[PDB]
């Protein structure tokens, strides 16, 4: 419900390690083939990180419905970044149960894409104003995830990271490790001139 966000800027980005780490249950990319994205220049990158169940990992995708994609973290239908998710059952749990991660279950209206709401105000499951205090048919809209090492696959914690690039006009700051040779002038060449490949 409070999915964290970080800005990636002014660096060389080696996606070969992430793609060939082979320890990822899900690595799917929208708007760019995963293999070729390494050889491409992005203006800015936003890496957004959080944790979810199993059955909800399918739900991190544009045009998806349900609790995560309607009340917690909504992906725009015109997405350009791409989704990484791997099992972290052994790290995020403990015997007896882990109750640190929350998730939102009751919201009046769906989330616009990339909108984060961290309020703690009571939900109106009933009709009478319960006045910001818990009462009959006024539940709490942050239900807790519970994680024990013994749970089934469907309830294990998947650590998820959304790598939302923006492929666009702006001066690229994050892209792959080319040699970046010197130019030639007045004789027509075929350049990969900052990703604007052409002759």
């Amino acid at each position, epitope marked *: 419900y409070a999915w964290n966000r970080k800005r990636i800027s002014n660096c060389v980005a080696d996606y070969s390690v992430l793609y060939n780490s082979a320890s990822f249950s899900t690595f799917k990319c929208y708007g760019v083939s995963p293999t070729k994205l390494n050889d491409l220049c992005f203006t800015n990158v936003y890496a957004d990180s959080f944790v979810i169940r199993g059955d909800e990992v399918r739900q991190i995708a544009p045009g998806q419905t349900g609790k995560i994609a309607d009340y917690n973290y909504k992906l725009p239908d015109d997405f350009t970044g791409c989704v990484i998710a791997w099992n972290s059952n052994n790290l995020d749990s403990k015997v007896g149960g882990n109750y640190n991660y929350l998730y939102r279950l009751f919201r009046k209206s769906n989330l616009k894409p990339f909108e984060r709401d961290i309020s703690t105000e009571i939900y109106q499951a009933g009709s009478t104003p319960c006045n910001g205090v*818990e009462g009959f048919n006024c539940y709490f809209p942050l239900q807790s*995830y519970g994680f024990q090492p013994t*749970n089934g696959v469907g309830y294990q914690p998947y650590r998820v990271v959304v790598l939302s690039f923006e492929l666009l006009h702006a001066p690229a700051t994050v892209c792959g490790p080319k040699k970046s040779t010197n130019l030639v002038k007045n004789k027509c060449v075929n350049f990969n001139f900052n990703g604007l490949t052409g002759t």
Partner: antibody
Amino acid sequence: VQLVQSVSCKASTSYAMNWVRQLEWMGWINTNTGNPTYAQGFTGRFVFSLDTSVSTAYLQISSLKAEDTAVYYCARPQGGSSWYRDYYYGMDVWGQGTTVTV
Amino acid sequence: IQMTQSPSTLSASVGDRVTITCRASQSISSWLAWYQQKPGKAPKLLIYKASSLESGVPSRFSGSGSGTEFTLTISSLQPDDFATYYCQQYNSYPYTFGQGTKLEI
């Protein structure tokens, strides 16, 4: 709103959870967080280790004693499942009750 | 805290009004509930807040009083209501029960 008594009470976390015996009070396990405080004589002697995704409030009776023979009820309070405020919301519905013999 | 109900065991005819009073060791301040348990089943709600009836409970059970002292009344005694009845408290942290009342026919 049916409570299944089998030791663990399978629910059936909109509301919290509560436990009692026969008639005293076991000490109000919270389901939305880690286990908070208990009854006066029921803190260290009786533990719950609730497990979710089936929402069963586990019981482990520590240092099992001769006169523990009793009928244990899991009871679902009226409302209020939140974190670290200690409602005055005791009991709404009940189940069949597990019969322990010692 | 401790709950003292004046009735302990009482019986009468069907169609009768029964009165039960329950007090506590100090000012409980309308934080009280009234329960009844039929034999061989876990107890059930009849009054919360010491003054409001439950979902689907018959209207003949009315709770009145204030401060420390509260009272349940049955307008038309029913033989199914033959059962034990318990007055518990909400103000003090330990929700304790009492010696209860028995109602027969």
